[PDB]
Amino acid sequence: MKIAIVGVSGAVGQEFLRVLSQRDFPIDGLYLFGSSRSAGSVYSFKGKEYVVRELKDNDDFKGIDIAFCSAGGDTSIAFADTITRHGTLMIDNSSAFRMQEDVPLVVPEVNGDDALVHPRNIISNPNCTTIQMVVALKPIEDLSHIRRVHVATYQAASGAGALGMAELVQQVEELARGEKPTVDKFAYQLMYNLIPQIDVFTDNDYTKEEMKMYRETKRIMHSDVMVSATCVRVPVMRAHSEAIWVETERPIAPEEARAAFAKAPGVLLCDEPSEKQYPMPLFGTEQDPVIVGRIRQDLANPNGLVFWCVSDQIRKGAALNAVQIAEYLIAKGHF
Amino acid sequence: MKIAIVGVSGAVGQEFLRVLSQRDFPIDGLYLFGSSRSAGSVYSFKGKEYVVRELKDNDDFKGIDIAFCSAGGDTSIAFADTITRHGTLMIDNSSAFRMQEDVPLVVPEVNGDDALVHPRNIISNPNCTTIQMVVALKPIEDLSHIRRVHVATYQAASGAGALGMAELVQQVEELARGEKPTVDKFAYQLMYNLIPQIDVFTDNDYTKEEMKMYRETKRIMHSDVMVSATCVRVPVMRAHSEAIWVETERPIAPEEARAAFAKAPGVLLCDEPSEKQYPMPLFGTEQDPVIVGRIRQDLANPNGLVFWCVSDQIRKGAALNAVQIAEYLIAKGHF
Numbered sequence: 001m002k003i004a005i006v007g008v009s010g011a012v013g014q015e016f017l018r019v020l021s022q023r024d025f026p027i028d029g030l031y032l033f034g035s036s037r038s039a040g041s042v043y044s045f046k047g048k049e050y051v052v053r054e055l056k057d058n059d060d061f062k063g064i065d066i067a068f069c070s071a072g073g074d075t076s077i078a079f080a081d082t083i084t085r086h087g088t089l090m091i092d093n094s095s096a097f098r099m100q101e102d103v104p105l106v107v108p109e110v111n112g113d114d115a116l117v118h119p120r121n122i123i124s125n126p127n128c129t130t131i132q133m134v135v136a137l138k139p140i141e142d143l144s145h146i147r148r149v150h151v152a153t154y155q156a157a158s159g160a161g162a163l164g165m166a167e168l169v170q171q172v173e174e175l176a177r178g179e180k181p182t183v184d185k186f187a188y189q190l191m192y193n194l195i196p197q198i199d200v201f202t203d204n205d206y207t208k209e210e211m212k213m214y215r216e217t218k219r220i221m222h223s224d225v226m227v228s229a230t231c232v233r234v235p236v237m238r239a240h241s242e243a244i245w246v247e248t249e250r251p252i253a254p255e256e257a258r259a260a261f262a263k264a265p266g267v268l269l270c271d272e273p274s275e276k277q278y279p280m281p282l283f284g285t286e287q288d289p290v291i292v293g294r295i296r297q298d299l300a301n302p303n304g305l306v307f308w309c310v311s312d313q314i315r316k317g318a319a320l321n322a323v324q325i326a327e328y329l330i331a332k333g334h335f
Numbered sequence: 336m337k338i339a340i341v342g343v344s345g346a347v348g349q350e351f352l353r354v355l356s357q358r359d360f361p362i363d364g365l366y367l368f369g370s371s372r373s374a375g376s377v378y379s380f381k382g383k384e385y386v387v388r389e390l391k392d393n394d395d396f397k398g399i400d401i402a403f404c405s406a407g408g409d410t411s412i413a414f415a416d417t418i419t420r421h422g423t424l425m426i427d428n429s430s431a432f433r434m435q436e437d438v439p440l441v442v443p444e445v446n447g448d449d450a451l452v453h454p455r456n457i458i459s460n461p462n463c464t465t466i467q468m469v470v471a472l473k474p475i476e477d478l479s480h481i482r483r484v485h486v487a488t489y490q491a492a493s494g495a496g497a498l499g500m501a502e503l504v505q506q507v508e509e510l511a512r513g514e515k516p517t518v519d520k521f522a523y524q525l526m527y528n529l530i531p532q533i534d535v536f537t538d539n540d541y542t543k544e545e546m547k548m549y550r551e552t553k554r555i556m557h558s559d560v561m562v563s564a565t566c567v568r569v570p571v572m573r574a575h576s577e578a579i580w581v582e583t584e585r586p587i588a589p590e591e592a593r594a595a596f597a598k599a600p601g602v603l604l605c606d607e608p609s610e611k612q613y614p615m616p617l618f619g620t621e622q623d624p625v626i627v628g629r630i631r632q633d634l635a636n637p638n639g640l641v642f643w644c645v646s647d648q649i650r651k652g653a654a655l656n657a658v659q660i661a662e663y664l665i666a667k668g669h670f
């Protein structure tokens with residue numbers, strides 16, 4: 001396979017290089033692309049060094065089998081025709097195509113078969129917090145149809161890219177040094193704070209991030225489920241956490257949910273109250289699973305189940321999910 | 336009015352001194368009590384110095400009108416008869432008496448009249464996170480009965496006392512200097528993390544903090560309301576935040592809720608999405624109101640309302656509520 005990474009400079013682009021090597025993805029040639037800013041930069045991959053080329057509207061994607069894109073929705077909209085011009089499959093981490101009926105929105109553990117039909121030769125990687133949630137919801141859905149979800153998120157600085165991570169760490173330095181915290185990538189100081197706004201507001205006063213959890217979940221799960229989210233930025237480095245209440249059509253006891261989670265692909269059950277075993281972002285960082293715990297009956301609804309889950313936003317919330325889409329297609333002989 | 340503070344050395348006892356001064360509570364005599372550890376300690380109040388006495392099983396409370404107590408559950412059990420022996424009204428910030436049906440459990444904005452009837456001469460100050468929630472719930476309850484609540488909390492380090500706040504701050508420094516973080520007053524590192532456990536677990540796998548939000552809310556609101564909480568410790572100094580979903584018997588639209596919050600005692604409405612105005616713990620610190628915003632319709636339930644609120648745990652969550660109970664009684668002629 002000949003593989004492209006479009007947008008290699010940033011956090012997700014760098015994770016693509018790590019994941020593709022950790023998972024021994026079958027590569028016979030690698031092509032790195034960026035803006036004029038990263039053109040000419042050098043990266044090493046599996047012993048060879050590669051030079052980034054500026055993404056231009058040309059024929060650079062002739063002969064490339066898959067392009068993993070982590071360059072922003074503006075780039076993906078502007079250059080989709082270029083990337084797919086010679087039959088390359090574009091697996092896009094951006095939000096650009098997530099609502100297009102002719103472009104599949106795929107989490108392999110949930111709806112991997114949707115990946116097999118791509119009229120535009122584009123497949124969309126879903127929103128990070130949505131991937132996390134539906135990996136956990138799928139084994140529950142298979143026990144009883146999920147009608148409603150309430151979710152409060154606790155989203156890491158990494159959701160705002162590397163610059164968001166850098167702002168947080170510097171604020172830590174300025175606070176231990178009695179200095180002035182610097183505020184720019186976030187709307188307010190993040191250290192010692194919580195910002196209940198992620199992305200811009202929409203006309204129903206939910207944010208775009210909250211509406212993604214509503215709209216993307218329906219597509220992925222092929223479901224009429226209704227998700228109402230409150231998305232909050234928190235002073236955590238790069239794993240996202242979610243407090244989830246699910247309402248199903250019949251009651252699911254914690255023991256049944258536990259059994260389902262323990263067998264569910266992509267899930268790690270971590271739920272031992274008496275040993276203080278529960279998912280935490282500090283320990284879910286740089287791990288593959290969606291980590292699930294604090295499972296209990298919903299005191300407010302006999303048909304409700306409550307739990308808590310954590311996932312690494314750069315891995316399963318982005319690069320890992322995209323690589324798993326490609327792996328799923330390979331296993332189906334798509335190439 | 337002769338006033339006692341029982342447990343003056345700690346964060347809550349110090350806040351009693353601050354609030355009582357700030358609000359010009361009418362005081363003719365001040366009597367400070369602690370363990371043998373703080374006996375002999377000197378505190379300044381309104382330009383005079385007071386010397387702490389060890390709390391003993393004696394007649395020290397003869398002549399004292401109200402005793403504000405924050406000395407631990409066991410201390411309140413051990414010494415309630417001493418404190419009330421001569422008719423003193425004991426307003427207790429501990430958990431000890433919160434479930435005793437002959438001890439009122441009071442948030443003045445909600446059920447202030449319950450404070451008028453105290454056959455054991457004890458009134459219990461509720462749990463911090465519960466006070467915050469019911470101040471916001473009451474204006475909604477008055478429009479339509481609340482059947483169910485889902486609440487995710489984002490609880491500050493000060494919930495574990497001054498030493499909890501101390502650990503968070505020191506960790507900030509250690510992480511700044513690249514040292515191993517001191518982990519002691521929390522179960523895991525709190526900086527850059529979230530700990531989805533507040534207080535010990537109970538038999539149904541909710542923690543005692545989550546079960547306080549379940550049980551105390553029923554008592555305060557005289558209601559069959561069922562509250563299901565996930566309580567999470569976060570690296571914030573001393574204000575608590577809550578993401579709340581409320582289900583009522585009829586639909587309450589966001590603008591109806593906003594109008595109710597705008598006139599609700601103890602509430603500050605802070606909700607302008609187009610101006611990025613919403614409650615945040617960094618800005619709710621050392622303030623009196625329960626700050627409410629992010630009000631919107633529940634996409635998962637036509638009879639649901641969603642919002643976000645913030646309050647200072649030492650002020651409205653503890654000492655301010657207790658002083659306000661005393662103020663309520665005084666306004667009703669109780670003394």
Ligand SMILES: Nc1ncnc2c1ncn2[C@@H]1O[C@H](COP(=O)(O)O)[C@@H](O)[C@H]1OP(=O)(O)O
Pocket residue numbers: 006007008009010011012013033034035036037038039055070071072075160161162
């Ligand atoms: N016009 C463009 N063409 C290709 N890649 C782009 C373009 N604009 C931005 N990118 C890339 O998108 C990524 C965005 O980073 P993040 O998503 O972490 O915020 C970077 O790798 C950036 O590369 P570059 O360094 O060349 O600007």
Ligand SMILES: Nc1ncnc2c1ncn2[C@@H]1O[C@H](COP(=O)(O)O)[C@@H](O)[C@H]1OP(=O)(O)O
Pocket residue numbers: 341342343344345346347348368369370371372373374390405406407410496
């Ligand atoms: N046996 C006791 N009698 C009176 N006050 C007590 C007793 N044990 C603890 N306290 C007080 O409980 C308060 C609250 O504890 P904290 O806020 O530190 O969690 C402290 O002021 C402490 O006072 P002391 O300093 O004398 O020990």
